Design a protein around this nucleic acid. Structure first.
Length: 271
RNA sequence: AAAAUCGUAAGAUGAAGUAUAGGGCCUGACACCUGCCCGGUGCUGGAAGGUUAAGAGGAGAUGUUAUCUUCGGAGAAGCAUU
């Protein structure tokens, strides 16, 4: 994490990530798939999910979220940067000959030989089921369904914690502060996710927002009453109660269905 | 199987992403700060008490008449309205 000197007004308060954990710059050719970006336009062509434009076309790296090769140790070969996510990748090479692109942890260096499966040790990098992760560990990449992949705690710097174990389910504290139950057969990876220094990055420039793929956002307050329910008015005016576009209140109104069939797994809300 | 957005649906964006992520709204680098009011209108939680829809339920009442009643009238069963 570097702090650029105030040479230019577009560089005064800019803070650049250090990328100190990255080793290799060239990716692996056999584990890359083509990907194109959309400006929010859906299949038919209508622009849904506005404010996303486009910039600096990227390539997709096939990340291995299942990690269903139990008993085969794999060595870390390189720690690389992925533009399609927030955390580093740290390519792995298995003992039999395969090469995968699992997501990296906080203390994963180049040279570590980590093993998967249930008979492994609770060390950083190793993946174990929740029936064998001992207790209160800072885990990540928690599976929500057995054999599907990684869902929870996948961004840079996140982690969860084990709480208890009752027969079939284990209580887990999601990064948001929500306490929820997850099957014991689900897998998870010990150790926090990488980067962890992403929240400290400042742009100091309107151009970086567009390098990342965003577009400027107009406030409905500076609009006409035909465009948004909050526009109009001689002079500078407010918009009454903030609505979204269809009269939906935008302050306190909860949008979670009170008849959600997955309500039998939530212990606290914190969202 | 996220919220949200387009459609009658199937489907699609969000996202081959996942809370250091994605939406809604206000202000607009930086320095010092950002006081009081929950009466009114919005939002969240509660639900002891009052009011309250459709749908169930059918006390009783009405119409007709087998029959009995010197006239008046009463009237079982069935069938319908309320």
């Amino acid at each position: 994490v570097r702090k650029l000197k105030p040479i230019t007004p577009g560089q005064r308060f800019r803070v650049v990530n250090g990328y100190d954990a990255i080793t290799t710059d060239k990716p692996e050719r056999s584990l890359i798939s083509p990907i194109k970006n959309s400006g929010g336009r859906n299949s038919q062509g209508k622009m849904t999910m506005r404010y996303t434009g486009g910039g600096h076309k990227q390539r997709y790296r096939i990340i291995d979220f299942k990690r269903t090769k139990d008993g085969i140790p794999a060595t870390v070969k390189s720690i690389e940067y992925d533009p399609n996510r927030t955390a580093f990748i740290a390519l792995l090479a298995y003992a039999d000959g395969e090469k995968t692109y699992i997501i990296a942890q906080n203390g994963l260096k180049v040279g570590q030989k980590l093993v998967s499966g249930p008979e492994s040790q609770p060390e950083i990098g190793n993946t174990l089921p929740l029936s064998r992760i001992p207790l209160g560990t800072v885990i990540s990449c928690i599976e929500l369904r057995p054999g599907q992949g990684a869902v929870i705690a996948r961004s840079a710097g996140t982690f969860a914690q084990l709480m208890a174990r009752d027969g079939k389910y284990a209580t887990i504290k999601m990064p948001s502060g929500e306490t929820r139950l997850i099957l014991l057969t689900c897998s998870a990876t010990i150790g926090e996710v990488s980067n962890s220094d992403h929240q400290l990055v400042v742009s100091g420039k309107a151009g970086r927002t567009r390098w990342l793929g965003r577009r400027p956002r107009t406030r409905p307050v500076a609009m006409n009453p035909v465009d948004h329910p909050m526009g109009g008015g001689e002079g500078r005016s407010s918009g009454g109660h903030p609505r979204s576009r269809n009269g939906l209140p935008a302050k306190g109104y909860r949008t979670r269905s009170k008849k959600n069939p997955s309500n039998k797994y939530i212990v606290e809300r914190r969202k």
